[PDB]
Paper text:
PfNCR1 is homologous to the human Niemann-Pick C1 (hNPC1) transporter. Our cryo-EM structure indicates that PfNCR1 is monomeric in form with overall dimensions of 110 Å × 75 Å × 55 Å. This transporter consists of a large membrane-spanning domain formed by 12 transmembrane helices (TM1 to TM12) and a large extension formed by two hydrophilic loops (loops 1 and 2), consistent with the signature of the resistance–nodulation–cell division (RND) superfamily of proteins. Therefore, our cryo-EM structure depicts that the PfNCR1 transporter contains two domains: the transmembrane PPM domain consisting of 12 TMs (TM1 to TM12) and the soluble PV domain composed of subdomains (PV1 and PV2). Combined, cryo-EM, Chl efflux assays, and molecular dynamics (MD) and targeted MD (TMD) simulations demonstrate that the PfNCR1 protein is capable of exporting Chls from the PPM to the parasitophorous vacuole (PV) to facilitate membrane homeostasis.
We also report the 2.98-Å cryo-EM structure of PfNCR1 bound with [name], a potential PfNCR1 inhibitor that heightens the sensitivity of [name] to saponin. The overall structure of PfNCR1-[name] is very similar to that of PfNCR1-I. Superimposition of these two structures gives rise to an RMSD of 0.5 Å (for 871 Cα atoms), suggesting that the secondary structure of the transporter does not change significantly after inhibitor binding. The structure of PfNCR1-[name] indicates that this transporter forms a channel (yellow) spanning the outer leaflet of the PPM domain and up to the PV domain. Similar to PfNCR1-I, this channel is broken into two halves. An extra density resembling Chl molecule is observed at the Chl binding site. The mode of binding for this Chl is the same as that found in the PfNCR1 structure without the addition of inhibitor. Our high-quality cryo-EM map also allows us to unambiguously depict the location of bound [name]. This inhibitor binds within the tunnel created by the PfNCR1 transporter. Within 4.5 Å from bound [name], residues I63, L66, Y67, V486, P555, P556, T559, I625, F628, Y1105, A1108, F1109, F1305, I1368, I1369, K1434, F1436, T1437, and F1440 are engaged in anchoring this inhibitor molecule. On the basis of this structural information, the inhibition mechanism of [name] appears to be due to a physical blockage of the tunnel formed by PfNCR1, disallowing this transporter to export Chl from the PPM of the parasite.
Residue numbers in the entry: 5 to 180, 292 to 674, 721 to 736, 1047 to 1151, 1161 to 1470
Write the structure that this text describes.
Amino acid sequence: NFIHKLKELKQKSLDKFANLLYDYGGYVYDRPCTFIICSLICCLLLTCGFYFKEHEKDIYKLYSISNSYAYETNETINDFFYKSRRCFILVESNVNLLKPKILRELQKFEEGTKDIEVDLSEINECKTNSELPPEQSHVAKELYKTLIQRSEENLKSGKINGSLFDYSDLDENGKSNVNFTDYKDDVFYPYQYIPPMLIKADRCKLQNVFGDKNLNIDLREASDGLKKQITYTLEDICEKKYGDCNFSSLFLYYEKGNGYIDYPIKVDNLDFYVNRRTYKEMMFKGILGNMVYEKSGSKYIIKSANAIMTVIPLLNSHTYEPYALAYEKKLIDYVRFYNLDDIIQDEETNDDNDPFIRFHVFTDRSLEDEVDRISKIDNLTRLLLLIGVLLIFMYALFNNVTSVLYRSKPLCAVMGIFCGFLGFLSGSGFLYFLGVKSVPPAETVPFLVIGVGVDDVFVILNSYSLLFMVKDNKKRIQMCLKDSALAITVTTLTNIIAFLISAISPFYSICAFSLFTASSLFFGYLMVLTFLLSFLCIEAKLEKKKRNIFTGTFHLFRSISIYEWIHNLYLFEESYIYEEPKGNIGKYFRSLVKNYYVPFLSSRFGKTIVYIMFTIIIAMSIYGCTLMKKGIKYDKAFPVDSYVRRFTTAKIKYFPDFGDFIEVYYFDKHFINKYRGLEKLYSDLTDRQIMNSPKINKNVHWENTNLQEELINMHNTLESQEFVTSVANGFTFFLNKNKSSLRKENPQEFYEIFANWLKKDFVGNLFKNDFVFLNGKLVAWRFHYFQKNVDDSEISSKWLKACKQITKLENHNVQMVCFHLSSIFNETDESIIEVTLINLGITILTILVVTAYIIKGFYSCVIIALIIFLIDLCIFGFMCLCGITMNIISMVILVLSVGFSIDHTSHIVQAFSHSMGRTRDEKMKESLHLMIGPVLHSGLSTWFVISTLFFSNKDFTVIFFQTLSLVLFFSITFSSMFLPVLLSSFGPLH
Ligand SMILES: CC(C)CCC[C@@H](C)[C@H]1CC[C@H]2[C@@H]3CC=C4C[C@@H](O)CC[C@]4(C)[C@H]3CC[C@]12C
Ligand SMILES: CCN(CC)S(=O)(=O)c1ccc(-c2csc(Nc3ccc(C)c(C)c3)n2)cc1
Ligand SMILES: *[C@@H]1O[C@H](CO)[C@@H](O)[C@H](O)[C@H]1NC(C)=O
Ligand SMILES: *[C@@H]1O[C@H](CO)[C@@H](O)[C@H](O)[C@H]1NC(C)=O
């Protein structure tokens, strides 16, 4: 019942679709020019949507997951801690930079950095046309006023008395829409600390940012010239150290006459030196690079150093967000354009090359700026696209031009390339009309689309090449379209399905890439059906009139089943319609396949050769699967010549120890929840469930001696790690300095002693900015440590996880969050495996269902599934073997590999099934002779368009090219060599 009825319905539907396409081709043949002009007009109207093109530049949006826990941690850190923007300025040289002349020049360079002036007209965030002051909640404003008043009063008083605070454990709700009464009695230590989330002042008023300048200007209500008159310098937005700017540079040694530039520098400690005159700290390890010293006379005498680093701290608050964002920009223009080669020319080098001195810069603005620059498509990508288009045009012309000119189809190939390009343009325009923003990966959308947009073309030509016997050109075109309609529709539908399923991934970059590719493929399919088919009709009319393109242009200026046919041909071979005419489209290639390749495959020697070769390939794939690596470094997304990558390379070169600045934070859950109230498919929610335990980070007694000893042991363990070079933990210093005083374990005593140590001690004065006390209880704190830089992301993620394990203190319900910039990318690399393993399964199931709906028989579907699984296994094994890691690009291409390879596999299998040969060998011969041309062409075209990406300056594009080339190579080999042999051996017969 079910088997009969479902198969009957399927066959009836397929036959009706074929007849509909037959009649559609018949209708198109009468109106080719009308279809051409209408399709072109529609494509241009859709392309007009490029005027609404937008780029997505947020790194979190592009690369992070939707519910990334790193995003939540960054939000918490910014809401409750005072971070400072850090501008790094590095200077490299094959010449030692410690000579007095170069030192004087670099001092002038630093003074120039200090002397940069920015006018208020450059503050793009105050343009008199924005709603920049959103409404802050009323209770928050009242609390901010009360807290600033209390901070002023406490700072004036300068007394620490924890006798009035309540030290009892908080309730589950935090007790001993939010009411101001609960918040109005909060006392914060240090007294100048107020939660940065509460500092929401009018950013466009100069009084809120520059009190000293005494100007009362509303930038949203000020003219452009009036704002341009007023200027500010570095000193107005720079973090202060004893009043002066808190510069971290070599020239702190010479400050206030402590040392002299001409004389050699002598320092009593190469790790932490305090300038006696200025009382300012300085770490020579972080400043100087390839440092060479003497260590004589109980001190260290530094002779040479081939690198110098300077760190400029800028205030990082809401009100100071734009101004710094302005100054940093100018700072970059001051560094990337600075030249001091004149002095360098004379001095002796290290590498014996021409002497050199290069300045590098890195800011928090730099990554966003580089992403913005990358978002626009560069000239190199356009040149590569042009070269790929030229290659595919040459290949198509070479295949479709033969000895006889009027039987050739060059115009069809050219218009097929044009159909691919127009489909890409129309799809991109439609999605821009829908509002989807263009991610940088979309730069690779054109190539791929063209690489697919030609495939259907070849298939149609194949059918039109096989129907030379039909004298009626209109009926010939109708039958050609009838034969090729199911194949073309299934191919495009499968590609669209694969890309749409890929678009489900949480990362917006992949979602946009897949959406653009799917829309472009759909519109390219429509263009193939109309624009290309009309040109096919025109060239068929010219062929019937026996005039080629040139003669036709001159005159215009003057003015039966194919399987049955191949079976009959092979039966006649056992001894007008059987023999192709001279100069046919695919005569020579089919002759080569039938005369040489088919006898090789049918021979026993060919079969055993193929079996041995593919056994070796599968074994190599398994061994590669054994060598599996995961993760890609983020900077690979940028070109090597970008100043960010150059700065990173240099830093790694001259400063191996100071690789990553990992920051470890502890937040009290009750405090965080109390102060947050003022603001008002994929289950890989990693690093979130652990931190949400009901009994963690709540009312932790820091006065406990056991907990302090555990903290000391944790610090020692963190120092013991090989990948950790230095640790800056103020809590450890406090505990080491004071042990007898803390024996009482009294919470009030602990609070008072910690406050006094922070307020009075020199090291405490340094660490004052890393601790938050509310109502006499330490509610949040932090420390930092440096991690060796490594080129492998997987080992870096392992180090971060080891650090998270070390910071865990389950005995006292304490776990500290470890954070870094690379944490987001590590989270993405950890989630990509699960995301891909889900998407691949969903894609495979859907594609198998779709192909089983169209493939005749059930055993053929099993063969197709086995071939698809083997192709995927080989692709993954060789991508692991070739050093490609399991990253976003490789995983997405692995997902799409099913949709790409199913086309060739289905072509060969359906050609085998529909044939009427008696033995398996005859059916294999017919299947090859019919559909080995299109299968080879549809892969060679895609690879020819893609190959130009091998020279792309962006490593992500290179990985894309490599993985796609592996996919295409394995699909072609398993569809043209392994599949025919497998069908000859065990293929179905009835
Ligand atoms: C002389 C002995 C007894 C004490 C000196 C200890 C040294 C190694 C410690 C104490 C103070 C520490 C600094 C305190 C604060 C900061 C700011 C932070 O953004 C980076 C780390 C940095 C710069 C720390 C580096 C290490 C440091 C300099
Ligand atoms: C550092 C901040 N970034 C995180 C890496 S990012 O802004 O999100 C970012 C991400 C990627 C690129 C990029 C350039 S070329 C490129 N080819 C590419 C081609 C095809 C596919 C499927 C993919 C994924 C990529 N992709 C550029 C920037
Ligand atoms: C703290 O305040 C209480 C309440 O007035 C007072 O009794 C105590 O002496 C104060 N402690 C100090 C050190 O001033
Ligand atoms: C504000 O008032 C009550 C009484 O003090 C307080 O307990 C509660 O937090 C608030 N009431 C609400 C939210 O209904």
